[PDB]
Design a protein around this ligand. Sequence first.
Ligand SMILES: [Ca+2]
Ligand SMILES: [Ca+2]
Ligand SMILES: [Ca+2]
Lengths: 219, 219, 219, 219
Amino acid sequence: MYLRITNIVESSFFTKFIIYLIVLNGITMGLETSKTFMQSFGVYTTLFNQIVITIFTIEIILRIYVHRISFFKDPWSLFDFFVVAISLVPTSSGFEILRVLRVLRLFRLVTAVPQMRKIVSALISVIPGMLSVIALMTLFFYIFAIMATQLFGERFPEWFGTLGESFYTLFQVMTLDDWSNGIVRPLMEVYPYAWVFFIPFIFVVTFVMINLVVAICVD
Amino acid sequence: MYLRITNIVESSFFTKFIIYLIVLNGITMGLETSKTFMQSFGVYTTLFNQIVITIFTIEIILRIYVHRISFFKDPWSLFDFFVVAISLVPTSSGFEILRVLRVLRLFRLVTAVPQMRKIVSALISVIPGMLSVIALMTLFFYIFAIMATQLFGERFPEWFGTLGESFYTLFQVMTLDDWSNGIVRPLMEVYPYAWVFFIPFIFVVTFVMINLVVAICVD
Amino acid sequence: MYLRITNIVESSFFTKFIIYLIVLNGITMGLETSKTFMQSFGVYTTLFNQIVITIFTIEIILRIYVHRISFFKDPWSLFDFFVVAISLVPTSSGFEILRVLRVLRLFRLVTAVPQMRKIVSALISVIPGMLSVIALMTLFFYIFAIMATQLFGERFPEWFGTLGESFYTLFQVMTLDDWSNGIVRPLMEVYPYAWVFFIPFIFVVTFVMINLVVAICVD
Amino acid sequence: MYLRITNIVESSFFTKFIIYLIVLNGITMGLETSKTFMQSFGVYTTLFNQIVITIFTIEIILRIYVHRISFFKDPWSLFDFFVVAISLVPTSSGFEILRVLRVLRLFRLVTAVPQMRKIVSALISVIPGMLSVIALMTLFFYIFAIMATQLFGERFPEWFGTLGESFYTLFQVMTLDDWSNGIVRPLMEVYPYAWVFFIPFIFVVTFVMINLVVAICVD
Ligand SMILES: [Ca+2]
Ligand SMILES: [Ca+2]
Ligand SMILES: [Ca+2]
């Protein structure tokens, strides 16, 4: 039966039948957004949903027999597996993010269609060349985030009161979002010199970030 | 009469006369802005406007004879038809946006002068080589916009209460506009972990956009 | 005496003496900032200033005889003339900006010291190859500023009340500064569809500006 | 005893041992952040902290006998000295920022591990190609900072009342952070024409910065 089904899985129909379901279930998830629509056709799309989830596991089952070890060494397939798994955890118990993480299946449209895969891949492959920078920066953030927790945390605990909080605040300064009126000016009402901490921090982080962008245009 | 008028339309005088109307009507439309100017010369400029609009249809009526099917396959020509057409819809009924859309005719200064034509074209030609990335993002946006509507829209309906609103809010985060003090710090007063949604969201969307710019500095 | 003075002017000492004055009058102007310093050395500096102004008009007079027509065809020289000229308008009558505009003479450090001239020129030289874009944009800004004044200026006259005001608001949106919480969300409380005007505006204006930068990163 | 210790210092186990202490002491400093943790294992830490500092001076002492003058001509080696030095100043007295500055030793992770060294150096090496532009800007900032202090500092002394404040505010406009609703719109409630000062300032500063970025995308 193997070659029989290996001809079902590889079929242009089967793959395009999947793509057809993704665009359908996607359309169906934007409808589940409407409180109004749920009062009309709630039960329609709840069944239609459970339906698709089976179809996608049947596929991922069929997909596994045909590929065996090759399937659990394919990024795109591994993905597809995990995104269906999440979609399998019972409509109850534990966390309810799992009910929300179910919308992650529409990322299969990125998997089941090339060019998307191409472009996603094109994007990802730049990451390794950045890891050298990304490491530098994380050490940098970690260092300043400690100083800040221990320099501003007592008077300004919302923003720097915890190592995590300082990370968040520092991230926020880095995106330059409301950084002066929102943070440094307040801080300076108490700590006149806080500008000595954040201006250098901004230069560095802004400089480094600019280099990272030119690095991705040297290749 | 065809070759006669094919020599009127195609003349340098015709074109340079058209350009002369645009820059004149453009000046007249900046004057219709002043409530003062309208209490003095409102009559002058309302007539002058209908005048140019006649002249512009006469010209477009002419232009079509000289080109027939070649005209309706020219982007720039199609444009002027549509833009004059909007200017044709009566100063009444329906919407008043049509009254406002009339100022779109000043885009003819782009259509009826080269280099502009060159520059616009230069720009537009970059779009197809973005469609792969653009598609990716619009799916990403759609996915999170759904996720966000169902994670935050009950307590925070202004921002995420509706699919559309999530799109708007997510766009705003993407432009990094007042995203932390304005939206996420609030959101975290109720959902401490909201930072787990927006920081990843920000990297992805920021990353991708850096590539789309590096892509345009390659082709 | 002409070759005597052409040997005075063209001398290294002359140039290095001018540069020496600029850095001194520059230092002396940062001191006229202090209300404290002015109460202890106000006169010291005001005389020193009137002094330097002489020394620079003497120089410019010398400089002119040595170059005649070659001078009023040198940008950098013209500059120095006009900048010193400003410094010549009496401490009274007229606008008081001319008193403030005096500090523009410190830009002579750019003009009278090479490598600044180089870098400045290097910068300026990029402007012509942007005039095509810059014109495009200005037309665009002009067209939308008109639309916005007649779409939003009745209920929102601070922001869009006048054609000039619209320009400013539109500039602000383009620098993406507090555009959503600060402007469009307000505007939407009245004009729900205002988002239809500002999102496309942002796309266009942001797109164009990316091209203009990639344009520069090619020439 | 020299070649004995020269072989100890140059040993891989020596280096790897240091890198081990850094990643250990880094983890220790992040724990000193928890107010909870210090009530539990503060003592455990503070003594381990002094231990590491002992070890690190010993290393730097060893490293000097084995390099002499070659040491104090090595940037990285100099760094480590001036970093451990900081950590040597007692837990008491005059500036307590020194207790905070101790955390700068985590930058030794950059100094000891290569690749980081590589990347940091790659970053630094872009600086000299910017000094021509940096100097230009700093002169620019200085000139406008002066004009502003004397144009706006009487009514707006928070923002422009002092040369330093003008510098800060001008930096903030440059990062485009809350520059219009936050600052210029206010300023215009008194000085209608303040837009004549800041829009040009923004262009220049924005333009320049774009060139500096492209200038890097060359070298
Ligand atoms: Ca920004
Ligand atoms: Ca901002
Ligand atoms: Ca803001």
